[PDB]
């Protein structure tokens, strides 16, 4: 399954999202070795990850080694797959000396054009919020397409400061005119960070993106993906 993701070629008949281009996940002169279930594949800035072989609506885990070949960091690489979007994250564990950090990699998919959004109606999205050592968060998000605004909330994470509101924010076009919502994160009604979600799918079926929550210990990343039911 994980091994098939690493070894199999694409399969037009596999459940989308079929592929994900690794960009942020592996920079210009890096190589990213992913391993699971006995298999290994190396990428490849620009390279495609065969997400078609992975289970939808779950986090798939691989061991990773990021290199430039000399090893910089290793830990666990996480991929969350929906039908029209997916994202990746890295749980660094070693750099060898124990040292942990969780950071989002790529947020990818078939972006919904800002110029081709639904003209009205209210959509509710339900999915997962995942952060360090915790893929059990629940994301609820609502978009009003008449107002072109979205809002939502993250619940059920073990770390109390990550259970935040995703405050109302406008949908805007990004540099490619993809529809994105960038807004404020609230903790006990007060701002403590920022979030960004892209809208994905021809009919805006999905959202995916991340939140960054400021703590006294640094910024914590939460990966976000939800879909209309």
């Amino acid at each position: 399954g994980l091994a098939d993701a690493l070894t199999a070629p694409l399969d037009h008949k596999d459940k989308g999202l079929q592929s994900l281009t690794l960009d942020q996940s592996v920079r210009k002169n890096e190589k990213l070795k992913l391993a699971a279930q006995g298999a290994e594949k190396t990428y490849g800035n620009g390279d495609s990850l065969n997400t078609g072989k992975l289970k939808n609506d779950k986090v798939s885990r691989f061991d990773f080694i990021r290199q430039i070949l000399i090893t910089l960091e290793s830990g666990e690489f996480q991929v969350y797959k929906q039908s029209h979007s997916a994202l990746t994250a890295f749980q660094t564990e070693q750099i060898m000396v124990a040292k942990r950090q969780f950071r989002i990699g790529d947020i990818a998919g078939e972006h919904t054009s800002f110029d081709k959004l639904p003209e009205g109606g209210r959509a509710t999205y339900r999915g997962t919020a995942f952060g360090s050592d915790d893929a059990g968060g629940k994301l609820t998000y609502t978009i009003d397409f008449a107002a072109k605004q979205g809002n939502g909330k993250i619940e059920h994470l073990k770390s109390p400061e990550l259970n935040v509101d995703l405050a109302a924010a406008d949908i805007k076009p990004d540099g490619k005119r993809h529809a994105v919502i960038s807004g404020s994160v609230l903790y006990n009604q007060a701002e403590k960070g920022s979030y960004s979600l892209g809208i994905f799918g021809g009919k805006a079926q999905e959202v995916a993106g991340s939140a960054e929550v400021k703590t006294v210990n640094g910024i914590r990343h939460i990966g976000l993906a939800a879909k209309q039911l």
Partner: antibody
Amino acid sequence: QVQLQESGPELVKPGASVKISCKASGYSFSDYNMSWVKQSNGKSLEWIGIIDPKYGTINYNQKFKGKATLTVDQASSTAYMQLNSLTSEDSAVYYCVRDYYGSSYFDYWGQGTTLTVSS
Amino acid sequence: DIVLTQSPSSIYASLGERVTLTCKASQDIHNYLNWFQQKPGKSPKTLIYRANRLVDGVPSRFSGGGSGQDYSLTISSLEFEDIGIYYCLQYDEFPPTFGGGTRLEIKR
């Protein structure tokens, strides 16, 4: 009237302790973190530590643990930094700095407090 | 701790010239970078956060860029009030750490 107004310059002997204040006005003090920064010789800058005034959580740069203690008084909207066991290496200008943007920690700065430790 | 380095350490430029300052981190800092400007005897002033976001009210002649380890601050057209020392800082991994500064001075 300026948002972060620090206490005046201090001149003390080695071995002494000082407590520097940073009085907040014009914004919601409890809703924003306050950090402290050391600038030595008008050049090199270092981050000392940060405190969340609402929740009381603190993080110290390891290098300053046992040198600096951060506290706040929410009722008077004042942040404090106490520096203990002073030596000449503690002579510097100290700044309080609050955050303002959701993805930044260091957005508006106090006017600075000069500390001189000398015998 | 992450190490931040700034080059060059001094820049001389004429009024109206384009100036670019550089900053490099010892590891990927995920765009969590500030730029501060400091005049003599004054406190630092934040100009950029998150590597490329302009602080409210900062003149549009300033802009931040970069990713991974390599960042820059560019002033499109140097003005006299821009003279001072510029520092970068990363806040991706605590403790936040500052670069050593680049002084911007006037050619004559």
